[PDB]
Structures are given as structure tokens and as C-alpha cells.
Amino acid sequence: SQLKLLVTRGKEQGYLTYAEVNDHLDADDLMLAENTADEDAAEAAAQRTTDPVRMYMREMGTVELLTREGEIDIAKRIEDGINQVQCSVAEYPEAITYLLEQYDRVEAEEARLSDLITGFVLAREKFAELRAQYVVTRDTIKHATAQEEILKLSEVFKQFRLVPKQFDYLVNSMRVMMDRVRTQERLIMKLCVEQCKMPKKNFITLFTGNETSDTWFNAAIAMNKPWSEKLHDVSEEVHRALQKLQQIEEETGLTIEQVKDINRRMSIGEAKARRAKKEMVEANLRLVISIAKKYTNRGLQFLDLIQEGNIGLMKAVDKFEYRRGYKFSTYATWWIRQAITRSIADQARTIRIPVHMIETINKLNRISRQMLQEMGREPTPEELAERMLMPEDKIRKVLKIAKEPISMETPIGDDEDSHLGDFIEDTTLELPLDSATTESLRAATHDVLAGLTAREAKVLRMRFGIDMNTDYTLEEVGKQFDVTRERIRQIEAKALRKLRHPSRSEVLRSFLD
Amino acid sequence: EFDAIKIALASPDMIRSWSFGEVKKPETINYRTFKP
Amino acid sequence: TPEEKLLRAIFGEKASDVKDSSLRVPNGVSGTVIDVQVFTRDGVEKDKRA
Amino acid sequence: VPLDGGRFATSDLNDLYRRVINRNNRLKRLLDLAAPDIIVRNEKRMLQEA
Ligand SMILES: CCC[C@@H](C)[C@H]1CC[C@H]2[C@@H]3[C@H](O)C[C@@H]4C[C@H](O)CC[C@]4(C)[C@H]3C[C@H](O)[C@]12C
Numbered sequence: 001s002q003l004k005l006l007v008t009r010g011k012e013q014g015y016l017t018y019a020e021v022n023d024h025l026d027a028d029d030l031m032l033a034e035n036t037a038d039e040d041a042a043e044a045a046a047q048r049t050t051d052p053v054r055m056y057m058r059e060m061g062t063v064e065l066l067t068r069e070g071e072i073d074i075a076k077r078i079e080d081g082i083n084q085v086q087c088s089v090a091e092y093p094e095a096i097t098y099l100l101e102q103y104d105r106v107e108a109e110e111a112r113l114s115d116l117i118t119g120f121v122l123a124r125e126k127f128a129e130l131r132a133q134y135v136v137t138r139d140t141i142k143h144a145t146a147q148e149e150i151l152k153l154s155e156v157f158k159q160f161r162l163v164p165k166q167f168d169y170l171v172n173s174m175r176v177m178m179d180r181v182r183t184q185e186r187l188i189m190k191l192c193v194e195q196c197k198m199p200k201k202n203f204i205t206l207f208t209g210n211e212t213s214d215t216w217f218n219a220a221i222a223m224n225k226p227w228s229e230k231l232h233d234v235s236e237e238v239h240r241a242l243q244k245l246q247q248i249e250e251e252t253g254l255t256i257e258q259v260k261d262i263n264r265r266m267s268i269g270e271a272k273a274r275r276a277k278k279e280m281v282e283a284n285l286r287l288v289i290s291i292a293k294k295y296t297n298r299g300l301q302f303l304d305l306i307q308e309g310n311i312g313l314m315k316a317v318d319k320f321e322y323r324r325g326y327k328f329s330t331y332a333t334w335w336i337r338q339a340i341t342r343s344i345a346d347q348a349r350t351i352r353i354p355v356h357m358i359e360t361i362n363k364l365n366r367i368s369r370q371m372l373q374e375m376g377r378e379p380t381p382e383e384l385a386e387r388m389l390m391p392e393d394k395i396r397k398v399l400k401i402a403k404e405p406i407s408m409e410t411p412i413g414d415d416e417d418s419h420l421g422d423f424i425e426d427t428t429l430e431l432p433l434d435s436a437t438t439e440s441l442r443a444a445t446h447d448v449l450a451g452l453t454a455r456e457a458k459v460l461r462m463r464f465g466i467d468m469n470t471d472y473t474l475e476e477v478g479k480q481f482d483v484t485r486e487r488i489r490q491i492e493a494k495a496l497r498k499l500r501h502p503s504r505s506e507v508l509r510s511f512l513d
Numbered sequence: 514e515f516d517a518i519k520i521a522l523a524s525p526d527m528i529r530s531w532s533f534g535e536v537k538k539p540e541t542i543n544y545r546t547f548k549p
Numbered sequence: 550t551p552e553e554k555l556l557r558a559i560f561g562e563k564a565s566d567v568k569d570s571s572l573r574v575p576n577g578v579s580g581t582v583i584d585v586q587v588f589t590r591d592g593v594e595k596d597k598r599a
Numbered sequence: 600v601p602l603d604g605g606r607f608a609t610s611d612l613n614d615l616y617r618r619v620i621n622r623n624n625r626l627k628r629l630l631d632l633a634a635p636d637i638i639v640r641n642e643k644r645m646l647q648e649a
């Protein structure tokens with residue numbers, strides 16, 4: 001409607017003014033103006049802010065700030081999560097064996113004692129106790145009382161605190177083991193169900209409950225059903241998968257259903273941790289944006305600063321505890337500032353400068369400012385070195401840094417919109433006269449070298465790579481000419497002497513200089 | 514030598530065929546030795 | 550390049566190792582020098598002319 | 600290209616390519632931390648813009 005009137009006016013007059021279009025109508029205004037100019041048709045006639053920052057502000061707005069207690073609950077939630085997964089992984093047997101083997105290797109002086117463990121809830125004594133418990137529990141797998149022994153082993157294992165790196169390594173190892181088991185199970189299911197339409201009911205009745213022997217598959221082949229008969233063709237791969245599963249069962253030492261339940265609990269705890277962390281960050285996005293407004297004109301665009309600040313917050317929220325009592329807005333601003341500053345020092349200038357050199361440049365700038373204000377005129381490199389404690393050559397080197405490259409389109413002609421890039425010459429091109437000189441030299445050499453005995457010409461072309469594919473030494477040309485590295489030198493010297501005196505080589509003298 | 518010019522859209526396979534390698538870092542040259 | 554190497558071997562000439570980026574009067578000009586002035590960094594030797 | 604002195608001159612395409620690569624690498628890093636969807640959405644919008 002409103003656009004239709006403006007279009008009618010423009011068609012009648014063929015042109016429109018900014019005021020008329022604006023009235024009859026920042027990025028939305030520019031988009032509308034661009035659309036209007038389309039006609040000078042059907043698509044434009046028929047036809048939010050598009051700013052990535054305004055949309056970010058909008059999407060962040062639908063959030064609720066957290067009060068002092070509003071964090072505490074979230075905090076405890078996180079702890080529960082992690083605690084759960086600990087209890088989820090305390091039951092894994094191979095973990096304690098790996099811990100003991102790693103500790104023994106450390107005792108073999110392969111690593112520092114303290115690096116292995118961040119203490120416990122003395123290190124050698126606790127390791128000895130752990131080894132004693134492991135040896136007394138591993139040799140008592142006998143079922144009836146073994147469960148209580150394993151429970152006590154895990155409970156004493158709980159008293160220990162593990163480094164995050166190796167704990168995550170153990171978690172990943174368990175995950176890959178479970179992934180191998182699940183991949184084998186999925187291969188079995190695909191080869192038995194899709195290939196033979198094997199009902200799920202039979203799989204539940206047979207596979208579940210034991211999941212160790214081959215009775216669930218091998219003994220089901222005689223069930224008098226079409227799927228059982230069809231399983232004969234794919235019995236080899238299923239049998240191999242069953243063998244792998246039986247081997248893995250030895251490692252697990254537990255019912256696979258228990259492993260599935262443990263993994264389910266671990267996933268629930270991980271999700272809880274994740275949801276808590278998301279809720280925390282969503283609230284703290286406001287803090288992140290508030291901090292990252294002091295670095296506007298530094299080479300990075302506002303949104304890049306905001307995103308780097310968001311990385312630091314996600315790192316803090318994972319490393320924040322409510323025992324200290326620091327109001328997040330005090331344990332978090334540090335990480336945000338660190339991340340933003342490091343990012344500015346890593347991706348703000350095209351020719352990257354290390355962090356330490358950036359700090360040196362900033363310190364030099366601050367000292368120069370102080371000196372300029374104090375003395376009044378200016379600081380010189382000698383005075384800068386005296387005030388800054390440097391050899392006065394490092395100062396000059398730092399001052400000689402290449403600053404920031406000039407845009408190659410900087411209008412410099414000022415007469416025909418010429419750019420700075422039109423006046424930069426190619427310094428590696430070979431002048432056309434030098435190419436002609438090279439060709440003339442080649443011709444002269446070819447002419448002269450034909451004026452001596454063929455053996456001399458061959459020897460000279462062999463030593464110097466004249467028209468040859470590659471240079472050659474004395475012994476190679478000797479192999480060519482059935483002489484040994486001495487007559488060849490003599491003939492070469494004779495030929496050079498012959499070419500030496502004038503009346504045989506005079507144009508070459510002209511080429512020389 | 515060619516006698517005609519053809520224009521069309523580029524598949525991801527075509528774009529990988531033109532290239533001689535993938536650019537992974539935003540770096541240009543060393544600030545000290547001026548080497549790539 | 551090979552051949553230039555042969556020319557050097559024949560006439561036993563060494564490599565310059567230094568270019569000749571000297572200041573010379575532009576082509577087509579002809580005048581008299583009326584003034585010369587030298588500027589040198591603080592930490593240099595100030596050749597006789599300076 | 601180096602100019603006389605310690606100065607340089609560069610085309611504007613180097614800046615644009617650097618921005619594209621920085622945002623792409625940041626997004627790839629971010630997709631490993633399992634960040635909240637707000638952050639990845641903002642990162643993808645920025646990548647499209649670049
Ligand atoms: C409107 C046109 C602007 C243009 C004429 C001005 C603006 C910035 C100036 C350049 C920069 O200072 C960087 C270098 C400094 C060196 O010392 C001398 C060369 C150098 C390229 C300068 C020459 C010229 O003076 C420039 C290009």
C-alpha cells in the first residue's frame with residue numbers, strides 16, 4: 001500500500017528523493033532503498049534488521065538474571081553430575097589396573113610423582129595401600145564374596161583424587177570399549193534383522209538375559225522359521241561378532257546390562273552438568289558483553305570480542321567452585337579479560353607478532369607517553385633505553401617493527417582515482433635486453449666451442465652444463481671416455497688455454513664487460 | 514587455441530580439484546625472517 | 550648459468566657481490582651542483598664530507 | 600609487498616580471507632566444547648556474514 005504509492009510516484013516521475021522514499025516507507029531502511037532502486041520489477045514490487053549483533057542481543061534478551069543464591073543450586077547440581085559419573089566409573093575394573101601400571105612406571109622415574117596425582121582426599125603410602133587392596137581383591141574373583149570385595153576396593157578407590165587428564169583418558173578408553181561393543185552389536189542386529197526380518201521379540205527373549213553364550217544365535221538357527229534358515233548365509237560374520245563379544249566379556253567381568261545401566265546414569269549426569277552450565281553461561285552472557293566493550297578499536301570487530309569472551313566464561317563456569325565465595329562477577333572477569341587480550345594479541349594484525357613482543361611494544365608506548373608528558377618535547381631512543389632498561393638496540397629493533405601494512409587501494413592519485421597499487425613495479429622480471437644478451441652469449445659459445453677438437457668440445461660441454469641436462473664431474477666423463485680423471489683435466493686445461501688468447505675468443509671478451 | 518568459453522557452477526569436487534592444498538592458518542609471513 | 554660459468558672460467562673473473570644503487574643525474578638534464586647537505590643517524594661515523 | 604623502509608602494502612583480500620579463516624577455525628574449535636546453542640548459532644551467523 002504505502003510502497004505502492006511511492007512506486008506510482010517514482011514511475012510517474014522516473015526518479016525519487018530520499019525524503020519522499022523515507023516518509024512513504026538502518027539496515028532495513030537500506031534494504032528497502034535497494035529494493036526500490038530495482039525498478040530504476042514484479043519481485044521488487046511484491047517485496048529482521050539483519051545485523052548479526054542486534055539478533056544476538058535479541059536472542060540473549062530472553063534470559064533471566066541469577067541472584068546470589070541462584071548460582072548455589074546450579075553449583076551443587078554440577079557437583080552431583082560429576083559425582084555420579086565418578087560412581088559410574090568406579091566400578092570399571094581395568095581403570096584401577098591402568099592406574100597401578102602407570103604408578104609403577106612413574107616409580108620407574110619416567111615421570112614426576114606429583115604430576116601423576118593431584119594428591120588425595122603420603123602419596124607413596126596411599127599408593128602402597130591401593131596396591132595392597134588391588135592384590136587382595138583381584139585374587140578373590142570367586143563370585144559369592146567377590147562382589148563385596150570389589151565394592152570395598154572401589155570404595156577405597158573413591159578416597160583418591162585423579163588428575164583431570166588421566167581421568168578423562170580413562171573415560172575415553174571406557175567409551176571406546178563400549179563403542180566397540182555397540183558396533184559389534186549393531187552389526188549383529190543389521191545382519192540378523194534387515195537381512196532376515198528377524199523379529200525383535202526373539203532378540204529380546206534370547207539375546208537379553210545371558211548375552212554371553214552362542215545359544216541366543218547358534219541354537220536359534222533350528223527354530224523352524226525363515227529367518228533362522230536365512231541366518232545360515234550370514235552365520236560367519238555373526239559368529240565372528242559373537243567370538244569378539246565373548247572375548248570382550250572377559251575384559252568387562254560384568255553383565256552387559258549393568259554396563260548399559262551405568263552408561264545411562266553417566267549420560268544423565270553429563271546432561272545435568274551440561275544443562276546447569278548452559279543455564280549459568282546464558283545468564284553470564286551479559287557480563288561477557290559488558291566486559292568486552294573496552295577493546296572496540298583494536299583490530300577485532302565487537303562480535304569477535306564477544307565470542308572470545310564467551311569462550312573464557314565457558315572455561316570459568318567449568319573451573320568455578322562456591323567454596324571460596326567469590327561472586328562469579330569476580331572469578332569470571334579475569335578469564336574474560338585474559339581470553340580477549342590473548343585473542344587480540346593472536347589475530348588482530350596481518351603479520352602476527354608474538355605475545356611477549358606485543359607486551360614489550362605496549363610497555364614502550366606507555367613509557368613514551370609518560371616521558372612525553374613529563375619532559376615535554378619527546379623521548380629519544382637513548383632516553384627510552386635509559387628509562388626502560390634495554391641495550392638501546394632492542395629499542396631500535398622494536399621501533400623498526402613494520403607497523404601495519406598500507407591498504408593497496410588507498411586513493412593516492414587524487415586526479416583519476418588512482419590507487420597505491422598501480423605504482424608498484426615487478427622487480428623480478430628479467431629485462432628484454434638481458435634475455436637477448438643471454439641468447440647472444442649462447443650463440444657465441446656455440447660458435448667458439450666448434451673451433452676445437454671434438455674431444456675438447458665434448459669435455460667442456462660435459463664439465464660445464466652447456467646444453468646438457470646436468471653438470472658432470474671428472475670421473476663420470478672418464479667413464480664416458482675410458483680415461484681416469486687425469487687426462488681429462490689436462491685436456492680441459494689445454495682447451496681453456498687455447499680459448500684464452502685473442503684471435504680465437506674476442507667477442508666473448510665483449511660479453512665479459 | 515580454444516575457440517569458445519563455457520561458464521557454469523562449481524561442485525565441491527571441482528573446487529577441491531583446482532586446489533593444491535588447504536589453507537588452515539590465517540598467518541601470512543614471519544615478522545622477523547619475512548618467509549611464508 | 551652454464552656458459553656464463555664457462556666464460557668466467559676462461560677469463561678468470563670473480564663475482565662483484567655488491568650492486569650499484571648509486572644516485573645519478575636523470576636523463577636529459579644538465580646543470581651545476583650548487584649545494585650538498587648530509588644527514589646522518591645519531592650513531593654513525595660522519596664521513597669526512599659531513 | 601615490501602615498500603621502501605620497514606613498511607608493507609597489502610590487498611584487501613588478505614584481510615577478508617583472514618577473517619573467514621579465523622571465524623571458521625573458531626567455529627570448529629567451538630563445536631568440540633559442546634557449547635550452548637546460542638554461541639554456535641551466533642558463530643554460524645558470523646561465518647555467513649564473513
Ligand atoms: C591522499 C594520498 C595519501 C598518500 C599520498 C600518503 C598517505 C600515507 C603515505 C604513505 C604512508 O605514510 C606509509 C609510507 C611511509 C613512508 O615514509 C613513505 C611511503 C609511504 C607509503 C607513505 C607515501 C604517501 O605519503 C602516503 C601513501
Ligand SMILES: CCC[C@@H](C)[C@H]1CC[C@H]2[C@@H]3[C@H](O)C[C@@H]4C[C@H](O)CC[C@]4(C)[C@H]3C[C@H](O)[C@]12C
Pocket residue numbers: 412413420423424602603
Ligand atoms: C602526487 C602522487 C604522488 C606519487 C607520484 C608518489 C607519492 C608517494 C610515491 C609512492 C610512495 O613513496 C610509496 C612507494 C615508494 C616506492 O619507493 C616507490 C613506489 C611507491 C608507491 C611510491 C611511487 C610514487 O612516486 C608515489 C605514489
